[PDB]
Amino acid sequence: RKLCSLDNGDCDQFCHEEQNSVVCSCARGYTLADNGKACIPTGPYPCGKQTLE
């Protein structure tokens, strides 16, 4: 358990070890946050989210 094998590399969604070291990415409709880890929704109904309203 090193990079992406160690807690998804701390990413919210997609994780990839690019030449050693983690690189996170997000599904369509989300944008990688400043931390380069969190995934921020673009619209009101982002994919994969249960609706609370």
Swiss-Prot record:
Annotated EGF-like domain residues: 1-40
Highest taxon of the lineage: Eukaryota
Disulfide bonds: C4-C15, C11-C24, C26-C39
Name recorded for this polypeptide: Factor X light chain
Species: Homo sapiens (Human)
Gene name in the database record: F10
